[PDB]
Amino acid sequence: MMYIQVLGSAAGGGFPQWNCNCVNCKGYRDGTLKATARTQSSIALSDDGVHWILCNASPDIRAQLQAFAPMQPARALRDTGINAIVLLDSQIDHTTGLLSLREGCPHQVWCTDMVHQDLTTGFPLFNMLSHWNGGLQWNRIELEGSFVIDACPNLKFTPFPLRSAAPPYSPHRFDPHPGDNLGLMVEDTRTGGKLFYAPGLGQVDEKLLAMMHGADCLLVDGTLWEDDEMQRRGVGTRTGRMGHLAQNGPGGTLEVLDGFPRQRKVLIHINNTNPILDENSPERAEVLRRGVEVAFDGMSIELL
Ligand SMILES: [Cl-]
Ligand SMILES: [Cl-]
Ligand SMILES: [Zn+2]
């Protein structure tokens, strides 16, 4: 059994976003929209239900742990259900939660050499936290092969490179490296059950689709309905391109997901401006129709 807990299902900013009065966030606050509040994207993985691997540490971490009881097993006066943290990139929305866990150090943190460089220079979390009882103990994710985190010996992680997209603050923002962004294949080696996790997905090539065909559950970027969704809502001028493949239209994730009728399909990392958030929207209805689920905070998935 592989347990996947959705701690946060929204894109950067969360839903509603603090400074946003777009149709979704305003409507949420007005009480006129049927929608559920979401914290920033983050999952936790277990092979036993007791020992948990956190995938990304969002700014909303404190409320996310609070809302998931197994994160506090209460086996000592100071205790946590978090046994390791895996980072897929060095973005602020995926790493900032580590500061909120400093009274719990040491932590085993898994990340690539490139992420580790960002996090010892431009956003020096490792250097800052070394001053709290030994800080973060780095475990290198190599860009080929697999890794096993000993707290969950039955989960085998196979990371796959996604393109570029280093954060604004990174000394190598203009100089993209393999290692900057990862998706994960996670396998329960007891059952052969496989999760394909790609919350940040710009492009789907040949290798990608073949991996996806091997998986039983596809947990994939659901950031924007349309490439220009920010401009349509009036809240910015950046496009999906940002490195997110929008749901709709040619080469979009729904067209891609059509090739995958057997797999469980879940959209996660959903922008505050995405119409799929509105429970009554035609876009939400189109997702239900194609057999695709919209992640929510507190969603529990059981794989095989
Ligand atoms: Cl503002
Ligand atoms: Cl960032
Ligand atoms: Zn908004």
Curated annotation (Swiss-Prot):
Give the GO terms filed under biological process for this record. Answer: pyrroloquinoline quinone biosynthetic process
Query: Which cysteine pairs are covalently linked by disulfides here?
Result: none
To which pathway does this protein belong? Cofactor biosynthesis; pyrroloquinoline quinone biosynthesis
Q: What start-end ranges are recorded for coiled-coil regions in this protein? A: none
Which Pfam families has this protein been placed in? Lactamase_B_2
* Keywords, comma-separated and alphabetical: PQQ biosynthesis, Transport
The record's similarity note reads: Belongs to the PqqB family.
Q: What is this protein called?
A: Coenzyme PQQ synthesis protein B
